[PDB]
């Protein structure tokens, strides 16, 4: 352990793309716990010289969610011995905090749009699209993409830009439109129709783009906390094997920052057909 | 520095529900060995070197070579 | 290794090499091309009040034998590639030149005193074997050590310090005898007859002790040439073996020196003989 | 140092011939192994904990005891390396001699054997400045029956076995036999970090 020195750590041009995708969504944030909805839809009578039917519906919806960043165990155990010997590990920990913060925004987006995690559960974009059944089967065509965009605008609110999953954007660029114009070609910035498309990495999502406009995004604050006393053991090796984490200061700092997101159902998405 | 030195670091993602702080960070190091040496002049430049000492025009050609 | 070094290592035994250079001194040191002529004796006696007579004696020494230094084989070839690529190895090679310079004085002193591997004829052991024997290493006795001092008194020779190897000193320190006289040991150095002497590292037998009288020392300098010639006679093992043609590259620095020792009239040396 | 530092290069040099020039090269390096450890006191420290909290004099005495324990920390590491082999480090003093080659024996005691031990060291070519000896071993080494005595000193400052001054240190060792130290590297980080 800690034999050869590398003196190198990975930094920037990876976490910046994930942070830009979360900012592109745009959502209102509130400091107070819970939410409230507005009263909608009221019955009206058409008959002459009569009171008729008269009923008004009232709606109220509260939203509250708590989020916490997970601390490292396997990689953190090796880093503890390096921190005492080298000063570069302390500077690397500050850069790792920014990567963990970028992963925190990435996990919140993957649970809703891609349905990978159970952070949002109820208010999810992928779950709402499956219930409404607006998704198109098979490969997405150039003419089919314009028809799908027009169908969403007629039923619900029109979306500015569709979400890209890296691999899906490359397949869309190869396809050409019927008219004398380049389809999904980026000269300086990539755009589906007008507004700039956001790229996000997802494990569950691979093919198909989902377009969403109205989406709520709220955050408690910044993810930063001091590390003290060892908790939650998974893998540790230095001199003797241990089942439960005890003794000395904590190997990795666990960050806490609450995040809540509410869905208004606007996403449609696309899924490939299998035979 | 002699040879080549490269360092890479990877961070692990933390759990949604708050219970225990997960650590474990991945580290990778890359190094390359053996450097290529430049070839020295042989009989080709040796014939021109004798002309360079006698003629003024051939002396400038040796510097250009 | 294949011509690779991460960190430079410090050389072992520095004080032992420096001590051997200072130990080789008996009859002054002066810079000369060959051997300088000795001082005139000229015997003088009072005798009678009226009569006046004085004896005259002339002494001269002829120039013979010169010092030679050879470049290192096999080990120097491995160091040649390291010095060209790394800056630390190049600085270490310059420090090694100073260490080899101390070894040059140690090699010349050991050959003249023991085994007779020197260019000079009739010195210490070679002078005693050719002229007359004083001591024997074959037989060891406490009474014989006292008898050796009595033989020196009849020969009329003055000695300041006796040169002895590290292996011979260990055997000379412990000896079984009924009565002990003149040993010192605890103060600075162990004495055989009753005089202080410094020990130098030399290839010699453990049994027997040698004494030095008067010998002239000559020195020209250390390390003149830095560039090394093509190897053919020297054996190479590292990287590539050389026998005929070799590439022009510096591996070991060449040193220029001149040394000539004056022949002594009386010297004590011990030779081992089988029973 | 954090670990063990690499040793200095030897590089053998000899004059030989006037024209010929040859020089030997030797490289030495030491790998990092073994680390020092300090443990908290049991039973006795628990009784002192209640006294230090209530009385001001006991709290000041505990701070003075930390300096006394720091001196004991160096004493415990030196005794384990020299005798009984209770140290983390492999191949040191007694452990190094038992693994490689034996020089002296504590089982047999003789005046002629003590002189014979010095002759064996001369053939091995090893330089020693001071020989480490326990208080119990020093009492037995001081008085010995012999026909002829050479190099002992005693009256000046310290008793010598071969003919060199040496300081005695308290260590758990047998009374019979004597041990000699040559060359050993020392490493230290500090004393008392956590209160």
From Swiss-Prot, chain B:
The N-terminus is cleaved by ribosomal processing protease Prp. It is found in: Virion. GO terms for cellular component: viral capsid. It comes from the Viruses. Belongs to the HK97 phage major capsid protein family. Forms homopentamers and homohexamers in the mature capsid forming a 63 nm icosahedral head with T=7 architecture. The procapsid is made up of hexamers and pentamers of this subunit. There are seven subunits in the asymmetric unit in the T=7 procapsid. Found in the procapsid with the scaffold protein in a 2:1 capsid protein:scaffold protein molecular ratio. This is Major capsid protein. It comes from Staphylococcus phage 80alpha. The lineage of its organism: Viruses, Duplodnaviria, Heunggongvirae, Uroviricota, Caudoviricetes. The chain holds residues 66 to 130 of 324 of the full protein.
